[PDB]
Amino acid sequence: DGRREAMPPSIVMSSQKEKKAVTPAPPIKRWELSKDQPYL
Amino acid sequence: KVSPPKRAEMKTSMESLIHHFKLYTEGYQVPPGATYTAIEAPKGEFGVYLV
Amino acid sequence: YSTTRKKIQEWVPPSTPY
Amino acid sequence: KLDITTLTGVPEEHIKTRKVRIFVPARNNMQSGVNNTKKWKMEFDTRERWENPLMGWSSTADPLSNLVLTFSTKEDAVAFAEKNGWSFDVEERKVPKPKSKSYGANFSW
Amino acid sequence: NLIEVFVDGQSVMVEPGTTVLQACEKVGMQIPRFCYHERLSVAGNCRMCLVEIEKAPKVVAACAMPVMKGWNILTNSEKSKKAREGVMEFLLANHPLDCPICDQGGECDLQDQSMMFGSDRSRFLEGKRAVEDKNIGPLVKTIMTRCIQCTRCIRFASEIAGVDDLGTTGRGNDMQVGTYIEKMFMSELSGNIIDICPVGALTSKPYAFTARPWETRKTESIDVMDAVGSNIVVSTRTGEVMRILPRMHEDINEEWISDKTR
Amino acid sequence: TRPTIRPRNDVVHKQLSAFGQYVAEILPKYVQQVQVSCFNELEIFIHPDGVIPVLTFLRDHTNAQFKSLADLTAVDVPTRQNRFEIVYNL
Amino acid sequence: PSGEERCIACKLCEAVCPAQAITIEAEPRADGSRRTTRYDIDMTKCIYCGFCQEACPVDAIVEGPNFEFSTETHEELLYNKEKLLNNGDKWEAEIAANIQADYLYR
Amino acid sequence: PVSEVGSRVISCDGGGGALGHPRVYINLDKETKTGTCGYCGLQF
Amino acid sequence: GRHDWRLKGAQSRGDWYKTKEILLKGPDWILGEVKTSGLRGRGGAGFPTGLKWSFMNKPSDGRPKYLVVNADEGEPGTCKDREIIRHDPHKLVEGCLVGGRAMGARAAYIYIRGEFYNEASNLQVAIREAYEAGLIGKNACGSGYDFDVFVVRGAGAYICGEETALIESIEGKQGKPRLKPPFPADVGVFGCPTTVANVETVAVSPTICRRGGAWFASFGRERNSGTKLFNISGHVNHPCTVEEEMSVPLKELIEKHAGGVIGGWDNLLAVIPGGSSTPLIPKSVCETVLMDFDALVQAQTGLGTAAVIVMDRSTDIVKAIARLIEFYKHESCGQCTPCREGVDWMNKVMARFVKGDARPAEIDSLWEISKQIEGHTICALGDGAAWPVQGLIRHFRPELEERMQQFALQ
Amino acid sequence: XXXXXXXXXXXXXXXXXXXXXXXXXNPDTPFDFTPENYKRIEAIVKNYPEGHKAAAVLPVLDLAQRQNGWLPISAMNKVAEILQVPPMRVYEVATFYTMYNRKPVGKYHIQVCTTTPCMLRNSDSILEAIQKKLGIKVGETTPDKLFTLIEVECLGACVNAPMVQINDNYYEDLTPKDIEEIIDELKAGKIPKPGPR
Amino acid sequence: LTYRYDHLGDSPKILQDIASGNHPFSQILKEAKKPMVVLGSSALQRSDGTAILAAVSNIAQNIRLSSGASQVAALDLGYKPGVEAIRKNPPKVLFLLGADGGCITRQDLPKDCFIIYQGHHGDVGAPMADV
Ligand SMILES: Cc1cc2nc3c(=O)[nH]c(=O)nc-3n(C[C@H](O)[C@H](O)[C@H](O)COP(=O)(O)O)c2cc1C
Ligand code: SF4
Ligand code: SF4
Ligand code: SF4
């Protein structure tokens, strides 16, 4: 079963009820340029 | 529970026929929730937000 | 055209007097 | 009394000469299930629905017969219709009384 | 004086004694069921209600054992779930492929229990038993074969209609809830069984075939054939009444209804 | 439990979690809660008065260079003290 | 092939059509077999999605190979049961040919 | 049309292997029997 | 005890003697004499019998207390009680009086199979003599205590072998055993508290009350206290009933009491202790296992109430197991679903197995489906049908598989 | 409620019921019991506590079975009327068990072991021998309507060799010729209860 | 009725007798907690309905001393007599539904055949009713 693996969302703060900076994700690299046909 | 049984099968075994029947009558339930999917449709990203 | 006959088939008063 | 009748485009007829009928739906009795029973809903009263002269279809006049709305609490529902300026017929939640059960009471004597 | 008992996690100050089923009913979580029915009687057949004790290795029928002494019970425990699939495959091992024609088809409890719990693949691979009909009266349309021996209906008859004409017969497979002897069973509460019958094994002839459950609107009101004033759910397929059913109400009908009114 | 069910990566759930904490601390005059839908979708709440200031920073860098609204959905719900429930993808 | 009609009014063709074009009103046969009284459909609303083609357990209704039946008057679009049967009579070797050629993929 | 012989329980499908009505078991011999949709009665 | 079933023969067993003394108007010491005796259930239950009977000790509550011997002797391979009842009713009667006193029980109904008609009759005669001597009823063989025996006949229902089913059989209701937790210890026949015991237990109890219960404890392993009758059957030279020490190895009792195995073949093969208990492979069956039931628990097996099914390889095991499962399928009332339908299910498959027509993959599912029944049915008959098959899959797989392919050539 | 105090003299009356055959060593009409049978059934009805006479159901049917040799539905209705119990419960009892016989039996209702231990002892040769004799196939009556073969589940006489019983009479240490000889002796009008060893 | 229950005799007999405690049944009625007196509507007609009601009420009085459609609605609003016994023939009767009481007699009809009939079936009342 897969649908039974559905789970309530993980939650943080619930504000209703050093330290370091951080990215949502590591930055993606710039793409290589097409290799075989660099220009058109 | 989500994909209807193949016809050769639904015509010859009980559970098959039942899930067939309910998949077309009531249809499948989905867990409550919300999302935004998006894909590279040719004109641009196509975006579905549903709950 | 209409299919499956009728509905209420309501009753009517008798021909005989009183 | 936050009346919003002017804001809704609804014709006066149907904020007037008909009534909502709040209730928590009864269990289908053929079922043994209980899930659909809970949670208030806000059914409107039925009006006329005749028959199509052709094909016998149930042609219908009223704007909003099929409408129905779930709720979490009754007070919220009543207040809801009040915000709409709606006539209403609130009905009690009617949870079954708990009952004693005993397999051995069948074998008293 | 009322015992504490743990539904899966949270504590619940449950009433003394009272069945595990009733405990989870009190927390509102709903165990899969068939043969049991309040306003009837408990029975050990149809062990679809099996649930797992917090510690004791083997599952016990939910409507059997009364709760006591700070019990905890994992309704969602995996062993419970394997148990339920286990039983459901057995029930479906013989119930005939009749869903499209069986008049119970819209809401038969057996279907929904098959969806919520039963394993989807078939893995029975032989031959279903099937049995001849037993004609019974102007009203009920017995079909059997779709019978699953939740005795239920007999527990209805002996304990409410009071007639004990119908009853179980035979042993093992071939045992049948049909009454022996051709004799017709007429009673004033004969109609309510059409409600009580778990599946399509017993369904009202007069209403038969005429409609399907997802269709009809279900107005609430009260009977007029009697001044007794029992609550009901009238059911109409658009501009025309289809069938009547009882609507439960503690002061009067309580889930039952008459018969002349039906 | 492999062929059918989705694998659901822990990693993304981590990064979104921590980042939710990150914004939760950076500007908590208004972030009611930073729930992460388990299939990797963060989603903070906002006091209705607070819309402009939050979104403003949401374009403004720290990491929140979330340019371009994808949409401005308006989910409705009859209950609740206030029914309409606006939503901003980014 | 026996010459008996297939339809048995499990009525879920009504229950799965998104346009809900279909309307059915079954009543018992004198023999006691389930049957329709006024199966009907209207091409005015039907979207030719072929959900009905999938849905039928007894494989009664079938989305026929014919694709041309443009007509003068709106009232003709709204097929009656008898009309469908006549279409089933006109084409039966053809349809049975398609289903014969196709069903294994189903 | 004429009823098939039986003794006793036997299959029906309406004769269309994955083309007929879904398989069922009629259960009669000397008695008239069935049925689903297939009229294939087993009076014999 | 095989000779002279009349009271004259009980004299060879010494009759009642000091039984009047045993009636000290209090179970208690004899109850302790039972508890200390270490006796466990002969019904295949294996439950601490003195503990089992102690449960009824509670001050009456005013409802009359009863007793019902589970005299049936049915299970396949089991003909233990036959020669007994046919040749020693009296000690059974004395046990009824002693143990009935142990409950303080007012009475002692005894259900029988209806097949045992002639000796239900002869039992009725010897019991009549027990009334004739004043042994029973008012006063009853001295000590002044009243007690009231009766003997019900049966009618072809092996399910009645189960105790609660038998109780339910008594009221005229069908042999459909009650759901727990009410007990005969709590609510038995009608509504009154009752109890049930194997013919062994009740017949041997007075002897515990004479000869020392610790002397009973001496035999076998301490947790397998005492002795038990051992039927021997199947491929055996001299099939017979033989009471014996619990701890005795099987090859011992066969090759001594039974006239021995017919060869060294069956030693390599399965031999079933009882019926519901599983067959075991080894050439080192007995060489490993000891007939006392716990040693069989080491072998993942029950005693099966000590009936023995010797099984040479001249006979295919599969045919036997299949016929066994047929024996179950004819009998299980079927009120609880998993039994009602699962047993028939297993029979339906076993047919394909003896046909050898089945695909191999099925066997796992069978072994799987057995798991589904293995704990679930409301009474043990479904479990008893369940186990042996699991043992067979546990063991003789190649026979099955090769039978399958050899059919597959066709 | 109530109770049943002992009656030692009554047990002797019950002894006749236990041995009415003596120890060796249907269209809803019609039926009625012999007076001696009323005597017996009262004598055994005494055996049960006064509160609930329903317990008397099982033995009573046996007596009817002992009388008619068969069980017409009218007899069931009769017993039902006697104990006031609904006929349906009676039918439940009539059907649920094997010893009862809705169909007429032969003057000798053969019934024979079929469970494995006798199969291990070759019950097959036995049944094949009798079948070879009468030509009857399993449950069909002889046209003479005197014999009725029935394969039977474990008789519980498992210790002993192939076995048969015909109306409460175990026969043991069977050999296929032996049974034939005993059918012959059945035609001789006398039987013992003979283990052959 | 399906269940065991005591059967009595005749109206004024067993009723007034138990009312005067002549019946042994009156005693068990005395020791009984919260006694219930069930009088059917059908019993009230029966030529002298009032007499029966008086007798049963007496039983109610005794217990207290010892201690330890289209019907109830109209009486909630006092439409008594309710019975047609007022007559005195009154011209132009107005049926809401003469399907029930139209079986009785049309005696006012020769005096006045006219009868408005406001029913919903052609049964009984309609044929013998103008308008
Ligand atoms: C002759 C006989 C047949 C039995 N048959 C069954 C049976 O079919 N199913 C079952 O679960 N128990 C059966 N039992 C066991 C009973 O259920 C009961 O637990 C046992 O007889 C009492 O054990 P005890 O004598 O050791 O106290 C049988 C017992 C006897 C003596
Ligand atoms: S009612 Fe009986 S047949 Fe019709 S669907 Fe539910 S279970 Fe299958
Ligand atoms: S009658 Fe109704 S309840 Fe009794 S078995 Fe057949 S279906 Fe289940
Ligand atoms: S599916 Fe085809 S046959 Fe079955 S009901 Fe709907 S239309 Fe009639």
Ligand code: SF4
């Ligand atoms: S055609 Fe497509 S849409 Fe129209 S009814 Fe059949 S399935 Fe539904």
Ligand code: SF4
């Ligand atoms: S459990 Fe299965 S076998 Fe044991 S009694 Fe109940 S039904 Fe018969």
Ligand code: FES
């Ligand atoms: S209700 Fe628990 S066993 Fe069926």
Ligand code: FES
């Ligand atoms: S083994 Fe077949 S009867 Fe005893």
